[PDB]
Design goal:
This is part of a larger assembly, with 2 copies of chain A, 1 copy of chain B (90 residues), 1 copy of chain C (399 residues) and 1 copy of chain D (54 residues).
Chain A: H1 11-20, H2 59-62, H3 66-69
Chain B: H1 7-13, H2 54-66, H3 81-89
Chain C: H1 2-21, H2 27-36, H3 43-55, H4 61-74, H5 76-96, H6 99-114, H7 120-132, H8 136-145, H9 147-153, H10 155-170, H11 176-191, H12 199-212, H13 215-225, H14 230-240, H15 247-260, H16 266-278, H17 280-297, H18 303-319, H19 333-348, H20 351-360, H21 376-385, H22 391-398
Classes of the chains: A mainly alpha (106), B mainly alpha (90), C mainly alpha (399), D mainly alpha (54).
Subcellular location (chain A): Nucleus
Organism (chain A): Saccharomyces cerevisiae (strain ATCC 204508 / S288c) (Baker's yeast)
Protein name (chain A): Pre-mRNA-splicing factor 8
């Protein structure tokens, strides 16, 4: 019932992954849209001389902010970015009860 | 720096029950740990560096990006007369 | 009658002693001791001892509860009596503003409930009583103690209690401390408690009661041989995640495999390095293996194999291992192995540097510094046999 | 591909394209705490080394 | 291939890949003969079993867990052996030994 559960299991996310040839490890994988033209030629951009590696930049993050973390994204759809779902259902046959959470101060 | 794919990561961890938001209105700067002006510094190129040499490495990277340091390996220091006061009197 | 009285007195004393003793280090022993002594004729005494103990260590209340339960399982009447006593104590505490006593008693009750000694009804009643006088400090700890259990048994009751607490928090001008307590309780709830005439006969009964109360190796080999680089092999080994028992065995197997190959391969060394980096237990295992080798398994090998082994060890020790080494009588195969190791070290390091490194570690076996009446001469000779320095210097030093 | 490391595509390959992350990787990462020894040694070796305005 | 460059194979990943592919192709040739290539119907038994137990007696170099790496950072800059790739087949935890481990490296 929580919609936010499907984070990086959206259709959109899947599409993005497909585009970027980037498996969300749980999800599916495809033939890449574009052939990986490895022709950087040791340029002054994106070099390991230049950049810093505090974050590992996981491919989880690629399909979440496609246009940012991934460089030269193509045919990439935009994903969702959601609210949290506090929804409590009683399984013991009781009626309107603050069970799982805590009372106000005053 | 450390907040790259923070929120997403959190979401992944928490099965989308916790939603992070990061912000910068306190304008709260802080010393990068470690100590700049160290030529020994760190071990790894590919991995994240250690914390004593963290400051240095970042600075170096920035320099490289700018085009201040010329080459694969370099340093940072004061340009003055008398060999920088004899390396600050040794 | 006099005899009986004496016995009772003795029993009481014993109980007291046990109570005094009771701790985590010697609990079983205490229990055993307790079992030895009678507690049917001296049931009251036992009860007194238990209660007193509870009043005193409160930290060892759980243990006490357990003991009571055990007793009850055999002699239920005694347990009942104890429970009654506890209840009385609680009542007294309530009456007299003896807060500490109440806390202790409450805790005991909770423990009992947990161990299926007393019913949760009593606990519920106590909670209710606490609520009626706005006493948050008393019921908060008790609830925590017997929370999960309460939930399991009387869920409705628990719910009611929670509701009451909530009401107190919100629909009553509570203190700061009280509020804090309430909050704590709530938090706990969220996680569900994360933290005589027939004397002889009786005696007879009690005594009766007392009386009553290769394949693996093969697999490893395959792994070693079904792997391109050593790294891969190491990874494979780690996948297996064999127990800290078998690590040594694995290491031994690896060594054997290495020996089997015609000459020393970097592969095995690499694998070892990988293992070593991975965990302290593997390092320990390696150390053990090394110890076994020079001590008891070295003299068994033929020469080439021995040489290979030495080389491997040198490689391990040039970087990864700590130079820790335990070395007239001990000189055939072993000496040659040592020589080989030294050679390997030299190759890896560089002579002077190697020497320096050796010096840096304690190293009494390889190079004993003290002259010891021309015992170092042998060592010097050995060193000379395989091109090396510093020996001469050492000799000069001693004269 | 996961973190830039998986094999681009399952086809062609002539293989599962399965990817166990190595436990040598961890080892490689770690010895700045445990290489560390070498560093320490190095350090040891090189360890010893206005009024008017006011 | 292996006797000529014993030591020098391990480092080159392309060569390893080719070997994996080549071996698979060879296997499929045999399976082509039997007009199937159903992966269950040819357990490694039938290929690697020697001729003296009725097998083909191939000499695999395919069951190696190949070094994968950040192809981003592989061709570029520097490298280390992290993340192994699959190697060649589904196995029944049957570690087929590899010819390289029975060849003494050139050094």
């Amino acid at each position: 019932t929580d919609k936010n559960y499907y984070y990086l299991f959206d259709k959109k996310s899947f599409f993005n992954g497909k585009a970027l040839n980037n498996a969300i490890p749980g999800g599916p994988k495809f033939e890449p849209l574009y052939p990986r033209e490895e022709e950087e030629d040791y340029n002054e951009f994106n070099s390991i001389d230049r950049v810093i590696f505090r974050v590992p930049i996981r491919s989880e993050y690629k399909v979440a902010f496609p246009h940012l973390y991934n460089s030269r994204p193509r045919s990439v759809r935009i994903p969702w970015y959601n609210n949290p779902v506090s929804c409590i259902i009683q399984n013991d046959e009781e009626y309107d009860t603050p069970a799982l959470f805590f009372d106000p101060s005053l | 720096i450390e907040s790259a794919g923070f929120e997403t990561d959190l979401r992944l961890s928490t099965n989308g029950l916790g939603m992070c938001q990061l912000y910068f209105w306190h304008k709260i700067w802080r010393k990068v740990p470690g100590d700049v002006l160290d030529k020994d510094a760190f071990i790894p190129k590919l991995k994240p560096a250690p914390i004593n040499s963290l400051s240095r490495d970042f600075v170096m990277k920035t320099r490289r990006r700018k085009g201040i340091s010329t080459g694969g390996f370099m340093s940072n220091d004061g340009p003055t007369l008398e060999k920088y006061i004899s390396a600050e009197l040794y | 009658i006099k005899f009986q009285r004496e016995n009772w007195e003795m029993i009481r004393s014993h109980v007291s002693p046990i109570i005094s003793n009771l701790t985590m280090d010697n609990l079983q022993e205490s229990h055993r001791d307790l079992f030895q002594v009678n507690i049917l004729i001296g049931r009251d005494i036992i009860c007194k001892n238990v209660v007193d103990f509870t009043l005193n260590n409160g930290r060892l209340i759980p243990a006490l509860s357990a003991l009571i339960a055990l007793l009850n399982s055999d002699i239920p009447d005694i347990g009942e009596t104890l429970a009654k006593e506890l209840m009385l104590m609680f009542v007294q505490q309530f009456n007299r503003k003896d807060y500490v006593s109440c806390g202790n008693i409450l805790q005991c009750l909770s423990i009992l409930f947990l161990y299926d000694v007393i019913h949760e009804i009593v606990i519920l009643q106590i909670l209710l009583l606490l609520l009626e006088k706005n006493s948050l400090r008393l019921v908060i700890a008790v609830m925590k103690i017997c929370g999960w259990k309460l939930a399991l048994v009387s869920k409705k009751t628990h719910d009611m209690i929670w509701e009451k607490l909530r009401y107190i928090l919100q629909t009553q001008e509570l203190s700061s401390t009280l509020r804090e307590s309430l909050e704590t309780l709530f938090e706990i709830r969220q996680k569900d408690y994360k933290s005589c005439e027939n004397f002889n006969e009786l005696t007879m009964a009690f005594d009766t009661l007392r009386q009553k109360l290769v394949e693996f190796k093969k697999k490893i080999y395959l792994v070693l041989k079904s792997s391109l680089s050593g790294d891969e092999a190491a990874h494979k080994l780690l996948k297996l995640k064999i127990a800290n028992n078998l690590k040594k065995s694995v290491v031994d197997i690896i060594i054997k495999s290495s020996l089997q190959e015609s000459t020393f391969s970097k592969f095995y060394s690499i694998l070892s390095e990988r293992m070593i980096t991975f965990h302290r237990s593997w390092q320990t295992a390696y150390n053990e293996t090394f110890e076994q080798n020079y001590t008891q398994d070295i003299e068994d090998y033929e020469t080439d194999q021995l040489r290979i082994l030495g080389k491997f060890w040198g490689h391990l020790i040039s970087y990864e291992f700590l130079p820790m080494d335990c070395l007239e009588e001990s000189c055939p195969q072993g000496r040659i192995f040592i020589k080989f190791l030294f050679q390997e070290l030299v190759n890896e390091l560089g002579l002077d540097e190697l020497q320096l490194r050796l010096n840096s570690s304690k190293l009494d076996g390889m190079f004993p510094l003290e002259g010891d009446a021309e015992h170092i001469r042998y060592s010097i000779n050995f060193f000379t046999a395989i091109g090396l320095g510093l020996l001469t210097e050492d000799m000069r030093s001693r004269l | 591909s996961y973190n830039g490391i998986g094999l681009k595509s399952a086809k062609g390959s002539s293989t599962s394209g399965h990817v166990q992350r190595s436990l040598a990787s961890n080892n490689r990462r770690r010895p700045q705490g445990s290489q560390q020894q070498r560093q320490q040694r190095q350090n040891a070796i090189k360890k010893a080394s206005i009024e008017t305005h006011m | 291939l292996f006797t000529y460059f014993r030591e020098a194979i391990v480092a080159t990943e392309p060569l390893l890949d080719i070997l994996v592919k080549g071996e698979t192709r060879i296997q499929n040739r045999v399976k082509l003969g039997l007009n199937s290539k159903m992966p269950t119907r040819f357990p490694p038994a039938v290929f690697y079993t020697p001729k003296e137990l009725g097998g083909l007696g191939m000499i695999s170099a395919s069951h190696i867990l190949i070094p994968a790496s950040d192809l981003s950072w592989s061709k570029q800059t520097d490298t280390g052996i992290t993340h192994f790739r699959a190697g060649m087949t589904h196995e029944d935890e049957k570690l087929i030994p590899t010819i390289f481990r029975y060849i003494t490296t050139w050094e």
